[PDB]
Design a protein around this ligand. Structure first.
Ligand SMILES: Nc1ncnc2c1ncn2[C@@H]1O[C@H](COP(=O)(O)OP(=O)(O)NP(=O)(O)O)[C@@H](O)[C@H]1O
Ligand SMILES: Nc1ncnc2c1ncn2[C@@H]1O[C@H](COP(=O)(O)OP(=O)(O)NP(=O)(O)O)[C@@H](O)[C@H]1O
Lengths: 663, 285, 663, 285
């Protein structure tokens, strides 16, 4: 009762590439175990009967004991050789459609595996027509298409404007904005982690007001920790950081009242570090400059010697003045000035006209156009002590600064996690605020793949839209797993499609959702293909090769051929595959009206449509979802709205009339 | 209709008069550029739209003007603006819409929405008279704050120049009224708010009053008293209130209060003062 | 013979917005004169009979004297009021289709003009159904679509990879790369400017080898000039800059032989600045550090005082050593070290074990972990003179550096243009190299709108393509101004279309082109609309509203409706408008086969197609342009190429067979 | 066929033997990963492709093997590679292509193109005979430089790892030969190149020689002499050349030269030495 499988393996700098095969079944698989532990677990899981390994395989301890060991030469694991050879069997020129394109570490392993199998069989193996990767994280994945298409953090052109992030991210600090961005690129499946966040969002909804003002005062703590590890942190980094610590007493007070175990755990991870707070308050002056070179960072009293050196330097301002007055009144020369010059040092300046009235003791230092500068021993002695004391005061200030790193780095462990706690809080507090402000509700989970929406809306569009956004119900299950969406363009097909995808992600990050009520089952993978032909067909195939019962698929008007017939013919056969074999949860939007025959013939399929009403030379979109199909094509109505002259419009209507009265 | 606030007074009364439970309001530039009130109450049919803007024309209509006291207020407003109306009734129907010169269908929920572009569109002066933007909106925020307190059961959402400003949730059946009170008046009043509930037969006094010992000049701007939902301001009621602060503690400083008097309709009464004076004095002691 | 027009005008901080109207004809125009001169010239050109102006119009001198003056209130020139009102007349919700969306200064002028006209006429004006802007730049055109679509400097995803620029920009310095980028966003029409560059490319083709090695040595001169204006230029900026001047003698020598007036003019503009070259050779040491703070920039001899201060400091090396040896051999303690510390200064260090054997003269300075450090009077005296001399040497070094800017800024004007000359040379030399290396030919210009290509190729693709790129002929004129392109997907429609646009731009920057021979007429505007429906219709309208006889238009498979009929109906009526009314030069690629009847019936129209041949288990794209139409729809063949399983493919072919045998 | 350079020798000779005037060459990774020679001369028909790779199967082909001198060299090469061929003749026809086991049509100009992948698939040793990629290409560049000098009338375009390396343009009827010479041998030789043209009856000496007074060790690597276009290296010819440098100036240093001897077919004749010696000596004086 054990499978008799073949496997191939090798390693580069980064990790391990792995491949497995059953020649009796035609099942061909791939993987890329990231670390030694996952690798050892995968070997145990698959249980291969024979194993091909590269002669440069370093960690021999993983493979020595396994049965059917075969030492292979290096040349067999060539990446582009694998590409060409795999392409030759499947009859392709690239592997984008199989969804293994960006997994070269695995691909090299399959390339060597391939060459062995051919030599052992010496027969064609048309029963092997495909390959799929075994993906480590059973907690979820999004393809390239979906990430850009939905405009989570990035609108399609390339910018960050009017995205999902743009509407939801009214956080107060940069590190919270960044943690938010990671969690949006990472919705989690573990029911328990989502329930932390749901209870939390419910418990904190009242206290939005009191906490966000305090969170703003923190600043960018996360990036400061990077520069502490590098020994390059600056005085104004410490100014905000110190100010952040002063809020922690207040934050510890307000969070104690929140009845939630996740909240109390975070409140502890937070901390206040009262000891390090006091240190910075005493060690640094209230308002420091940008760099260390300028000095004026360290506060007096904290260091006895620093004060001493400053006394020699600060004995300047009062000393210079006494000499100026004494010398001016002694000589009776009013243009007598005491000034400073970086090159020549301190001096006593006298104007050209009075220069000949100067005292005998004055040694001339610097001659100028309209004045003569002199020096005396009293000023020259004082000159040297001030510059050298300043240099030593500034040099001591730079030493004490470097020594502060030595004393703070011992708490680095607890501080990194304090920062991770604070970033999480800004994210969650912002979320509790968005749920309350934008009118969201608490959803529930289910066993089997299914979605049931009550008054669902698009979270970005509803607020940016300068009109009433029409909310719509949705009913999906394993018994209703595919919807044929017919209707006019700008009817709201893509919007009602894209609102569903955005709603789903919100639920799987633990958040409340724009609806009256929501129920939702498990989802394994989310797939997307929206119109911008080679482009189109390769991507659709990928979705077909990798999908299961749990998969979400959003098709936006695919099935454009090189003519009218062929494109539709594909769309029909495609939907068959999804409905009958895969049984995935699918939304199929299109303009080809003939598809509306499917619900009669295919179980689990029904007709829906975006309803519209025509009158005179205009149209009114109700934007409401209805059972049934569209009345007609509304292309003639849409073209007028774009700005087309009547000459063309009139020709089109006359021509359309001919075609519609054929049959 | 001199100010934007008086035009808002009128159309906001009309929406509530139709049984509206959510009144969402979006403004731009002190009410000059844009004003939008949407109500989700009872709407107006396709028949009652066209003639409510444009009067011997009543000849062939057959007394539909009767259902349109609001319909009268529109006429005064729309003649002096680029008014853009849209609405739909409760029964199976499509929404309708009028302009400028061309009336046609549209899509809208069960209710009514209105759009106004810098009201005066033919007057060079009356627009040019219209005062600042920030200050006009402060009188809007004021009149909204007045009508918000008068109706706790209606959701009112207010925005300005994209920026969302205020969000008064509606009180459900016997709900927590604390959340609405704090949102209207800020944290300052809610923390010092002492509840009052007094009653001798027909006279009923409901509401809230700030604790005199911790009242500041900022809190003292909140001085509203209502007579069956309508805000009144008479000198006799002010006397009862301020005399009550005076006799409890020697500090005779400006009180902060929100009070509702409920009686049978008669136009005007000394027990009125004694009832009120004793109501507040009891709560402080 | 001359116009009785109405006009409206206003100004903001940046420039002037202008609008003109003939109410008798329905011709409605717009403009945005950038400066006062062009504004005064436009008024003279149009000759308005009545003029509406804003009460805040500042420069009254432009308008005082003109006839029919009418002072208008400010509220009438509101931008969003104009948007709504214009949208109301045309029956649109936005003005993207009219091609004036990005011109708010003009739009405000039209908004005020509009309100006046309505009130004066008090009649409907359906004879005014459109608006177009009068464009200042008669030289050069590209809409938003074309700039991104062709991937000149930017591939569509957002990056710079494998663009036109990427293949052709093998320049040796950054400023040449930047000037190239500006000239590609600016092809010029003046035949004479193009003939400068053609003669130059021909005259320099031989000398490619000898000059590019020398051009590389320049570095980024252009951006250094920015930091000179700001007083922030650095020592390593000057290192390369100095090295650049040393090549100019050599460059002046090699350029003298190039027989070309444009070249000789540039060789003079270039210069060598022998005076400023000598200055830097003497004033700075041959290899300087990154910053000025560190010192070691200024070379000795150039300044007598700098040398003097360094003598005190350079009296260190020999002095310290003598003391170390004397003291070590005197005491007999081998761990005796003379070292330096920033905080405590110079010291004599002795190890812990030997510390008790130290002389009595040794005063203790610093106590450490493994050692005791001491100080003696001889070292302490010398400590003070070295630090003070270093300070003064370093302070003088910073002063002299700042004074170098004062003396160089007087030549700033000639130097900026020297840099502009050098950037132009790197661009043009690179171009002469690409024309020779990539096998290009010299083109010619003509009178009438028309293009004749002999063996034309796509310049990026042909080199990156690891297969034979099939060159193709093109024959276009006013008598052959529209081509119906039928054929398969991946046939080479878009490629043969896009190679034509790239070829055209190369000719209008003065460059040689990938072909055996080329002739080309005047082209006024280039328009593009390529597949990503709201998206499609608005952009098509824009092309319709603004095109002329000279206009180049590239349609890539438009005419998709909300069903099958309506889209084609439009495409038919569209091509009619372009062929019959506008008479523009058009390439119309599509999949709808029925359009191929047009050449018989419409003059100046002919059928072309990308030919393909089907046989056995495969298909062969000849990639050659042919007269006639495609054989069939190739959608079923294209789907297999993307990567689709045979289950779906086989169902589609069987199903297509059913549909085609209905009728 | 031990090296890649010997495999290039063979296929490059076959292309020129078909009257090819443009031989464009693209390589990757020292010739291990990819090698592509395309010629635009005479091609091969659809019949002569398949059998030129693949033996009692010759039973029913009937001597088509004869038209395939080059077709022999293929067989030795294709049995030990993943050879990917494509070609088209001059006459009315579509291009064809062979693989791996399946032959089918393709698109190609009038000529022939060949593709070779990653050799040795069963030899532990012959692969382990790899040198370096960079050094293998330097021997390719060497052998290309040898054959480039032997044929001035053929355009040769050379690239490696995408990066284009060399571009030898073809000489038209009696054309400018200086541009080709400098491109093959760089700047150093072209500047000191002294022409030589000598002739007594049947013997003809054509070519170029560097000025002995300004010759460096770098220039001295260029030492090629041809006998009717085939490169020879015999020690008696070396003697004539070096003795000529010796007798003009005392510095007997390594000469730099490129020479073509043109004679009647025999294996090689004393005047051969004297003719060459006097040819070079005259040019130096
Ligand atoms: N629920 C809704 N409420 C209000 N407006 C809506 C709603 N759904 C869609 N719309 C509007 O309808 C338009 C069309 O949406 P969309 O779904 O993209 O149409 P489509 O059929 O996909 N064609 P295309 O836009 O060309 O891809 C959008 O511009 C929305 O403003
Ligand atoms: N003249 C040519 N020579 C060689 N190859 C070519 C040529 N033209 C096109 N090709 C190749 O054939 C493919 C087809 O070109 P393309 O013009 O993109 O087809 P298409 O009609 O645009 N299909 P789609 O991208 O779905 O709209 C391209 O990927 C090119 O690499």
């Amino acid at each position: 009762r054990q499978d008799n499988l073949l496997a191939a393996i090798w390693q580069d700098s980064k990790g391990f590439g792995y491949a497995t095969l059953d020649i009796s079944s035609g099942r061909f698989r791939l993987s890329e175990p990231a670390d030694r532990e996952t690798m050892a677990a995968e070997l145990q899981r698959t249980n291969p009967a024979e194993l091909l390994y590269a002669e440069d395989f370093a960690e021999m301890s993983l493979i020595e004991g396994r049965r059917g060991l075969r030492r292979r030469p290096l040349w067999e694991f060539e990446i582009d050789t694998a590409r060409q050879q795999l392409n030759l069997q499947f009859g392709t020129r690239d592997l984008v459609g199989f969804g293994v394109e960006n997994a070269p570490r695995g691909l090299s392993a399959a390339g060597a595996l391939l060459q062995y199998a051919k030599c052992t069989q010496r027969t064609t193996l048309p029963h092997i027509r495909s390959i799929t990767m075994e993906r480590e994280q059973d907690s979820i994945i999004m393809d390239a298409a979906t990430r850009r298409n939905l405009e989570i953090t990035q609108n399609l052109a390339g910018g960050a404007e009017n995205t999902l992030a743009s509407v939801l991210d009214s956080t107060v600090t940069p590190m919270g904005s960044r943690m938010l961005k990671r969690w949006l690129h990472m919705p989690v499946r573990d029911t328990r982690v989502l329930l932390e966040r749901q209870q939390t969002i419910g418990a904190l909804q009242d206290f939005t007001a009191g906490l966000q003002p305090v969170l703003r005062q923190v600043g960018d703590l996360e990036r400061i920790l990077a520069r502490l590890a590098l020994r390059t942190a600056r005085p104004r980094d410490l100014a905000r950081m110190r100010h952040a610590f002063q809020q922690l007493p207040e934050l510890r007070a307000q969070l104690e009242t929140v009845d939630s175990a996740p909240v109390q755990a975070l409140r502890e991870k937070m901390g206040e570090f009262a000891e390090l707070r006091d240190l910075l308050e005493r060690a640094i002056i209230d308002t420091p400059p940008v760099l260390v070179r300028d000095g004026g960072v360290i506060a007096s009293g904290y260091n006895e010697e620093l004060d001493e050196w400053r006394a020699l330097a600060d004995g300047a301002t009062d000393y210079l003045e006494r000499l100026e007055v004494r010398e001016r009144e002694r000589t009776g020369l009013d243009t007598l000035k005491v000034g400073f010059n970086a090159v020549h040092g301190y001096y006593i300046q006298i104007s050209r006209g009075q220069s000949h009235l100067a005292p005998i003791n004055y040694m001339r230092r610097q001659t100028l156009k309209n004045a003569e500068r002199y020096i005396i021993p009293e000023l020259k002695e004082y000159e040297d002590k001030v510059l050298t004391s300043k240099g030593k005061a500034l040099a001591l200030e730079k030493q004490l600064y470097e020594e502060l790193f030595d004393l703070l780095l011992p708490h680095l462990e607890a501080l990194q996690q304090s920062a991770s706690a604070l970033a999480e809080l800004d994210v969650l507090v912002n979320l509790a605020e968005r749920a309350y402000t934008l009118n969201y509700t608490s959803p529930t989970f289910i066993d089997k793949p299914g979605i049931r929406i009550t008054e669902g809306r698009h979270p970005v569009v509803e607020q940016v839209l300068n009109e009433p956004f029409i909310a719509n119900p949705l009913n999906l299950s394993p018994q209703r797993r595919m919807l044929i969406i017919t209707g006019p363009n700008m009817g709201g097909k893509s919007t009602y499609m894209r609102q569903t995808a955005l709603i789903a992600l919100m639920a799987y990050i633990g958040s409340y959702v724009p609806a009256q009520k929501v129920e939702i089952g498990p989802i394994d993978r989310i797939f997307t293909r929206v119109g911008a032909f080679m482009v189109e067909m390769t991507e659709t195939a990928n979705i077909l090769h990798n999908a299961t019962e749990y998969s979400l698929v959003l098709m936006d008007e695919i099935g454009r051929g090189t003519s009218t017939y062929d494109g539709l013919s594909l769309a029909w056969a495609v939907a068959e595959n999804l409905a009958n074999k895969i049984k995935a949860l699918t939304l199929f939007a299109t303009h080809y009206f003939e598809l509306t025959q499917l619900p009669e013939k295919m179980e689990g399929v029904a007709n829906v449509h975006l309803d519209a009403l025509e009158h005179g030379d205009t149209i009114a979109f109700m934007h409401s979802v209805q059972d049934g199909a569209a009345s007609k094509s509304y292309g003639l109505a849409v073209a007028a709205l774009a700005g087309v002259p009547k000459e063309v419009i009139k020709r089109a209507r006359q021509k359309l009339r001919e075609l519609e009265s054929i049959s | 209709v001199e100010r934007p606030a008086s035009v808002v007074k009128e159309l906001v009364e009309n929406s509530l008069d139709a049984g509206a439970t959510r009144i969402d309001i979006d403004i731009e530039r002190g009410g000059a550029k844009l004003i939008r009130i949407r109500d989700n109450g009872s709407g107006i049919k396709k028949d009652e739209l066209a003639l409510a803007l444009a009067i011997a024309s009543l000849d062939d209509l057959e007394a539909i003007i009767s259902l349109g006291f609001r319909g009268e207020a529109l006429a005064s407003i729309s003649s002096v603006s680029r008014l853009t109306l849209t609405s739909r009734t409760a029964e199976q129907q499509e929404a309708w819409q009028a302009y400028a010169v061309t009336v046609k269908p549209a899509a809208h929920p069960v209710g009514t929405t209105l759009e106004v572009l810098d009201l005066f569109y033919n007057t060079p002066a009356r627009r040019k008279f219209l005062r600042t933007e920030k200050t006009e909106f402060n009188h809007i925020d004021e009149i909204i704050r007045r009508i918000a307190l008068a109706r706790f059961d209606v959701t009112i959402n207010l925005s300005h120049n994209g920026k969302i400003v205020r969000q008064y949730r509606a009180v459900p059946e016997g709900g927590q009224k604390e959340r609405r009170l704090g949102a209207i008046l800020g944290t300052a009043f809610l923390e010092q708010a002492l509840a009052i509930e007094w009653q001798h037969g027909d006279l009923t006094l409901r509401g809230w009053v700030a604790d005199p010992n911790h009242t500041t000049p900022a809190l003292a701007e909140i001085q509203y008293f209502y007579v069956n939902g309508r805000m009144m301001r008479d000198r006799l009621i002010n006397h009862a209130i301020r005399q009550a602060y005076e006799d409890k503690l020697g500090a005779d400083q400006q009180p902060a209060f929100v009070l509702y008097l409920e009686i049978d309709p008669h136009q005007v009464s000394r027990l009125v003062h004694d009832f009120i004076y004793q109501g507040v004095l009891s709560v402080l002691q």
